[PDB]
Design an enzyme around this catalytic site. Structure first.
Site, PDB file in Angstrom:
ATOM      1  N   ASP A  10      52.490 123.405  45.514  1.00 42.88           N
ATOM      2  CA  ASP A  10      52.888 125.084  45.623  1.00 42.88           C
ATOM      3  C   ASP A  10      51.240 125.726  45.719  1.00 42.88           C
ATOM      4  O   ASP A  10      50.524 125.616  45.022  1.00 42.88           O
ATOM      5  CB  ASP A  10      53.381 125.403  43.989  1.00 42.88           C
ATOM      6  CG  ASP A  10      53.299 126.963  43.865  1.00 42.88           C
ATOM      7  OD1 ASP A  10      52.849 127.788  44.847  1.00 42.88           O
ATOM      8  OD2 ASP A  10      53.848 127.277  42.811  1.00 42.88           O
ATOM      9  N   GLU A  12      48.428 128.404  46.902  1.00 41.77           N
ATOM     10  CA  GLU A  12      48.000 129.847  46.540  1.00 41.77           C
ATOM     11  C   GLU A  12      47.424 130.236  47.962  1.00 41.77           C
ATOM     12  O   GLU A  12      46.663 129.480  48.524  1.00 41.77           O
ATOM     13  CB  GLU A  12      46.957 130.080  45.501  1.00 41.77           C
ATOM     14  CG  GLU A  12      47.460 129.757  44.125  1.00 41.77           C
ATOM     15  CD  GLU A  12      48.854 130.590  43.889  1.00 41.77           C
ATOM     16  OE1 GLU A  12      48.732 131.536  44.159  1.00 41.77           O
ATOM     17  OE2 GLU A  12      49.497 129.827  43.096  1.00 41.77           O
ATOM     18  N   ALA A  13      47.471 131.586  48.272  1.00 45.11           N
ATOM     19  CA  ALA A  13      47.050 131.984  49.733  1.00 45.11           C
ATOM     20  C   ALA A  13      46.204 133.426  49.657  1.00 45.11           C
ATOM     21  O   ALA A  13      46.618 134.029  48.934  1.00 45.11           O
ATOM     22  CB  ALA A  13      48.061 132.070  50.564  1.00 45.11           C
ATOM     23  N   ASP A 110      56.220 127.764  50.931  1.00 45.81           N
ATOM     24  CA  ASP A 110      54.775 126.820  51.134  1.00 45.81           C
ATOM     25  C   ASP A 110      54.988 126.050  52.232  1.00 45.81           C
ATOM     26  O   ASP A 110      53.897 125.724  53.032  1.00 45.81           O
ATOM     27  CB  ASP A 110      54.893 125.975  49.762  1.00 45.81           C
ATOM     28  CG  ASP A 110      54.750 126.797  48.490  1.00 45.81           C
ATOM     29  OD1 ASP A 110      55.672 126.535  47.765  1.00 45.81           O
ATOM     30  OD2 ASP A 110      53.490 127.210  48.380  1.00 45.81           O
ATOM     31  N   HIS A 169      50.344 132.393  38.975  1.00 43.62           N
ATOM     32  CA  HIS A 169      49.995 132.510  40.292  1.00 43.62           C
ATOM     33  C   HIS A 169      48.575 131.497  40.422  1.00 43.62           C
ATOM     34  O   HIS A 169      47.881 131.705  41.411  1.00 43.62           O
ATOM     35  CB  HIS A 169      49.307 133.647  40.834  1.00 43.62           C
ATOM     36  CG  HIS A 169      50.575 134.789  40.791  1.00 43.62           C
ATOM     37  ND1 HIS A 169      51.924 134.703  41.787  1.00 43.62           N
ATOM     38  CD2 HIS A 169      51.015 135.702  39.805  1.00 43.62           C
ATOM     39  CE1 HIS A 169      52.591 135.686  41.258  1.00 43.62           C
ATOM     40  NE2 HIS A 169      52.169 136.150  40.180  1.00 43.62           N
ATOM     41  N   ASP A 174      51.592 126.540  38.107  1.00 39.91           N
ATOM     42  CA  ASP A 174      52.875 126.891  38.693  1.00 39.91           C
ATOM     43  C   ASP A 174      53.469 125.598  38.921  1.00 39.91           C
ATOM     44  O   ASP A 174      54.610 125.277  38.717  1.00 39.91           O
ATOM     45  CB  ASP A 174      52.567 127.638  39.934  1.00 39.91           C
ATOM     46  CG  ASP A 174      53.453 128.946  39.902  1.00 39.91           C
ATOM     47  OD1 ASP A 174      54.457 128.765  40.742  1.00 39.91           O
ATOM     48  OD2 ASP A 174      52.952 130.014  39.315  1.00 39.91           O
TER      49      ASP A 174
HETATM   50  N1  LIG Z   1      52.958 140.377  44.377  1.00 37.14           N
HETATM   51  C1  LIG Z   1      52.564 139.599  45.504  1.00 37.14           C
HETATM   52  N2  LIG Z   1      51.892 140.367  46.393  1.00 37.14           N
HETATM   53  C2  LIG Z   1      51.422 139.774  47.682  1.00 37.14           C
HETATM   54  N3  LIG Z   1      51.402 138.467  47.870  1.00 37.14           N
HETATM   55  C3  LIG Z   1      51.669 137.510  46.816  1.00 37.14           C
HETATM   56  C4  LIG Z   1      52.808 138.135  45.645  1.00 37.14           C
HETATM   57  N4  LIG Z   1      52.859 137.070  44.668  1.00 37.14           N
HETATM   58  C5  LIG Z   1      52.465 136.019  45.493  1.00 37.14           C
HETATM   59  N5  LIG Z   1      51.874 136.290  46.668  1.00 37.14           N
HETATM   60  C6  LIG Z   1      51.650 135.242  47.872  1.00 37.14           C
HETATM   61  O1  LIG Z   1      52.074 133.937  47.586  1.00 37.14           O
HETATM   62  C7  LIG Z   1      51.105 132.907  47.482  1.00 37.14           C
HETATM   63  C8  LIG Z   1      51.751 132.049  46.435  1.00 37.14           C
HETATM   64  O2  LIG Z   1      52.611 132.584  45.566  1.00 37.14           O
HETATM   65  P1  LIG Z   1      52.908 132.100  43.931  1.00 37.14           P
HETATM   66  O3  LIG Z   1      53.665 130.731  43.899  1.00 37.14           O
HETATM   67  O4  LIG Z   1      53.756 133.222  43.444  1.00 37.14           O
HETATM   68  O5  LIG Z   1      51.507 132.146  43.365  1.00 37.14           O
HETATM   69  C9  LIG Z   1      50.052 133.751  46.514  1.00 37.14           C
HETATM   70  O6  LIG Z   1      48.833 133.185  46.599  1.00 37.14           O
HETATM   71  C10 LIG Z   1      50.054 135.027  47.410  1.00 37.14           C
HETATM   72  O7  LIG Z   1      49.204 134.845  48.664  1.00 37.14           O
HETATM   73 MG   LIG Z   2      51.949 129.483  43.066  1.00 35.79          MG
HETATM   74 MG   LIG Z   3      54.335 129.352  45.517  1.00 34.76          MG
END
Ligand SMILES: Nc1ncnc2c1ncn2[C@@H]1O[C@H](COP(=O)(O)O)[C@@H](O)[C@H]1O
Ligand SMILES: [Mg+2]
Ligand SMILES: [Mg+2]
Length: 225
Positions: A10, A12-13, A110, A169, A174
């Protein structure tokens, strides 16, 4: 017969606030969580941060949402280097050779978005081993029989009577929560299996009624010529 290991990834970006439609994401965290399907235990976890090369300065929104700091990405390897290491880890735990295994992610971003875009940016061929995966949100939706909007990580945890452990996040934490759901679903008797893939650089489903097939042992992709 069944996968011996589920390999949960999973990312992060990079991101902006308001989630602007044309912003180019880069992977900033690449975790791996190795779930042993037999013991039902999380056996290995590996975390690595990635240094972006296009939009190199993380936004405030990003630093706060993910918790990852500029000093962290600045001191990190670039994506191809991190990928070589992930592949070396997988090779060490003997996935694809000694053990039958499969990738699992939480949703379909992903692989089909983040890894997809990143490989283009890094001028890499998309790695074969990652062309098929288990999207657990899809698995969950079909197993418990609920609409797609009810498969958000938050709701899955809640409905299963569990908690989110660690930081939101943060990719490692995660991934671990995801693995914890995987376990629980395996226990509820659901046979988690590949249900999504890449085809002509497009997201496509994969028949759930076809026999269990292992992901090939990973290789390091070359640079696209
Ligand atoms: N509320 C949000 N607004 C913008 N980008 C998001 C948001 N939630 C997740 N992302 C993008 O999706 C990536 C991974 O999602 P997550 O698994 O929810 O942490 C994050 O590193 C963000 O780049
Ligand atoms: Mg994540
Ligand atoms: Mg994700």
């Amino acid at each position: 017969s069944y996968y011996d290991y589920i390999c949960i990834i999973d990312f992060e970006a990079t991101c902006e606030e308001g989630n602007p439609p044309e912003f180019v994401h880069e992977i900033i965290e690449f975790p791996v969580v190795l779930l042993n399907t037999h013991t039902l235990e999380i056996e290995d976890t590996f975390q690595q941060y990635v240094r972006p090369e296009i939009n190199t300065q993380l936004s405030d929104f990003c630093i706060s949402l993910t918790g990852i700091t500029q000093d962290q990405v600045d001191r990190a390897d670039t994506f191809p280097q991190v990928l070589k290491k992930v592949i070396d880890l997988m090779k060490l735990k003997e996935l694809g050779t000694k053990y039958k295994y499969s990738l699992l992610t939480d949703g379909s971003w992903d692989m089909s978005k983040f890894l997809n875009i990143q490989c283009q940016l890094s001028r890499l061929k998309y790695p074969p081993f990652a062309k098929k995966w288990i999207n657990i949100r899809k698995s969950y939706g079909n197993f418990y029989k609920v609409p797609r909007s009810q498969t958000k990580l938050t709701i899955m945890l809640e409905k299963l009577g569990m908690d989110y452990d660690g930081r939101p996040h943060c990719g490692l934490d995660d991934s671990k929560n995801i693995a914890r759901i995987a376990v629980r679903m395996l226990q509820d008797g659901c046979e988690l299996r590949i249900n999504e893939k890449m085809h002509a650089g497009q997201l496509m489903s994969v028949s759930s009624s076809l026999p269990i097939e292992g992901t090939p042992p990973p290789q390091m992709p070359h640079f696209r010529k």
